[PDB]
Amino acid sequence: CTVFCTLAGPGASCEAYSENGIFNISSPTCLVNKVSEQKINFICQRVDQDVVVYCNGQKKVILTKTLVIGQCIYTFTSLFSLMPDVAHSLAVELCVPGL
Amino acid sequence: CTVFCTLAGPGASCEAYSENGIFNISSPTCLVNKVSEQKINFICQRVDQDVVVYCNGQKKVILTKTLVIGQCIYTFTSLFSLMPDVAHSLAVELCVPGL
Amino acid sequence: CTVFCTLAGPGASCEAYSENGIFNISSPTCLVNKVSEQKINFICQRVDQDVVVYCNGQKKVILTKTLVIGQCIYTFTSLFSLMPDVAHSLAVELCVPGL
Amino acid sequence: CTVFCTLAGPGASCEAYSENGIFNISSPTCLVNKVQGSEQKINFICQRVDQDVVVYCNGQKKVILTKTLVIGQCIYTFTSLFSLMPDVAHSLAVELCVPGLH
RNA sequence: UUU
RNA sequence: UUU
RNA sequence: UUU
RNA sequence: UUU
Ligand SMILES: *[C@@H]1O[C@H](CO)[C@@H](O[C@@H]2O[C@H](CO)[C@@H](O[C@@H]3O[C@H](CO)[C@@H](O)[C@H](O)[C@@H]3O)[C@H](O)[C@H]2NC(C)=O)[C@H](O)[C@H]1NC(C)=O
Ligand SMILES: *[C@@H]1O[C@H](CO)[C@@H](O[C@@H]2O[C@H](CO)[C@@H](O)[C@H](O)[C@H]2NC(C)=O)[C@H](O)[C@H]1NC(C)=O
Ligand SMILES: *[C@@H]1O[C@H](CO)[C@@H](O)[C@H](O)[C@H]1NC(C)=O
Known part of the structure; x- marks a missing residue:
């Protein structure tokens, strides 16, 4: 899907978006883990590692x-x-x- | 239909509002697409072009x-x-x- | 009820909160109008006037x-x-x- | 559960998160009070941070200084x-x- | 000063 | 320091 | 300039 | 660097 994040404190505040709906989404770095909405908001407590989001089977990396x-x-x-x-x-x- | 945005990183964080409800909304540059709720929050990843939002049959342009x-x-x-x-x-x- | 706002661009981003639920809320200057949940978030496009919110028959003014x-x-x-x-x-x- | 806040005006904007769902969440100062499955995450604000952020979530006391x-x-x-x-x-x-x- |  |  |  |  599409992932957009801005910085928030020491980490980040993010939105995941897919026009046809988000069916599954998870992250090793961010507080999101769900297995149908087209928009999902979540935060990442740190961005020492880049933001990694798995969404609808696709790995996304926002450096x-x-x-x-x-x-x-x-x-x-x-x-x-x-x-x-x-x-x-x-x-x-x-x-x-x-x- | 009313649109209000503030800057967010490279883009914009926005809300569309209609007291009697939003029946449809789209944008060439912002992450929103619906074919009835009073309020819809969405983001625009870039504002290199002005924020153009279609809402309830009206063309909204926030420069x-x-x-x-x-x-x-x-x-x-x-x-x-x-x-x-x-x-x-x-x-x-x-x-x-x-x- | 309780109202807390922070500045957002030319205006304010706000939340109203009531322990026993928000039954009515409206505002002459903010985008909120309901006639039941504990919490509602809303924005005010300008704060040239103070933020005035009617909530559960009570008048709230955040200067x-x-x-x-x-x-x-x-x-x-x-x-x-x-x-x-x-x-x-x-x-x-x-x-x-x-x- | 997990609690993450950032500063907002004089206070803080917060999120609480529990993988198995948040069933109970309250605070001596922040505007959050829920008792009763349920949602993995809840957003709430704290009007002041003079006295840290204390959240009671799913029976455990969280303190974000x-x-x-x-x-x-x-x-x-x-x-x-x-x-x-x-x-x-x-x-x-x-x-x-x-x-x-270092 | 979101039109 | 949201009254 | 969120890939 | 949200414990
Ligand atoms: C969230 O908070 C509530 C209340 O503060 C917790 O409710 C507790 O639930 C347990 C069972 O789930 C109750 O034990 C039961 O008591 C009844 C008699 O009242 C008995 O018939 C049952 O066999 C069982 O022993 C417990 O009393 C109840 N606590 C209170 C104060 O009423 C709930 O467990 C909390 N949930 C989480 C995830 O923390
Ligand atoms: C979006 O919804 C609005 C509100 O219903 C639509 O506006 C009307 O649509 C009908 C259908 O053709 C027209 O007959 C009216 O003249 C429209 N009125 C106004 C004030 O726009 C609008 O057509 C819808 N547009 C899209 C793209 O979905
Ligand atoms: C909203 O609810 C309150 C409390 O029941 C009531 O007094 C009031 O007339 C209602 N309407 C408005 C506009 O406040």
Whole structure:
């Protein structure tokens, strides 16, 4: 399915989403273990290891690096927020390595 | 139908609300798709394009610029939070173009 | 009942809670309208006016000033967070007018 | 059961989780009170964290110290500060924030 | 200041 | 420090 | 920029 | 680094 997480304290807050429904979902690092909703919210207490979610038979890995890139965008968007027409695009340009 | 989002990492965390219930909702860029509940919470993994949400036969467009204006208000409210009587209105005055 | 909100972009993210269940809840400025569970979460798009909630025939007002005090505590706890034994109480001492 | 909280305004936003289901959960300060299978997880808030987070869940007393919540916010804060170096930001923040760590 |  |  |  |  699709997994989206943002940082929360020392860990992460996540959503799993599948348009046709989430039938099973588990994680070695996060508090989710269920075997039909299309959205499931869960947390990960630490992100020392990357976020690993098994969802509908598919292994998903959201790297902690990827989470930090997303936090970078949030932080620099806020820093530039008196220029609201350009803040988000400026933050993406600074924060995403391969651009 | 009302849509409200705040920034979350690289994207947005959102709610769609309709007092008499949401009968259908979709988005080209956000994780929501329904073909009756008052409230639906969903996320948008990116806001490089503005948040476009279809709800109850209406096209809703929340500009990323509008989301950054709201983040500006949050950020400057916190900056000024030792002056809790005026911090919010000061933040609105700085952050909302025109005022 | 009990109402607790924190700041979210230009507005607030809130919860109402009542030990014996929430039978009625509404608000002139927040997206909540029910006419039975212990807890409901709702958002307020703006806090230019204080957050006013009617819950179980009781009128609840959380002042924006109060919200900002709470955000002060959050912000200065983060600022002092390399001293985790005293960061929270230090933030309360700086941020709460009656101390 | 398991309890994880992060700071929210003057208090905390929390989640409790038990693999076999949460049947009883209460708190001397947080807004949670359930008695009676049932759901694996419940979200609740605490309006203040002056006196740590104490949760009675499935007969066991859980205490998440405010100090621990602040270490966690330290990691969030320094990860953000270091976020232009996304390969190392989290590890750096842990190294700085977790007392005694080497 | 979510239109 | 949500009254 | 959640793969 | 939620014990
Ligand atoms: C959650 O809390 C409740 C109450 O605090 C616990 O209820 C307890 O349940 C056991 C059996 O499941 C009760 O024992 C039974 O007592 C009756 C007489 O009242 C007897 O006829 C039965 O044969 C059995 O011995 C126990 O009395 C009851 N406790 C109280 C205070 O009423 C429940 O077990 C808790 N669940 C978890 C997972 O902690
Ligand atoms: C989503 O639901 C709305 C609400 O019922 C639909 O709106 C009406 O749909 C009927 C069906 O064709 C039309 O005759 C009306 O003119 C519509 N009214 C309005 C105000 O939109 C809408 O068609 C539905 N759309 C989708 C894509 O499901
Ligand atoms: C809601 O319930 C209360 C308590 O029963 C009642 O007094 C009130 O009239 C109801 N409606 C509103 C709008 O408060």
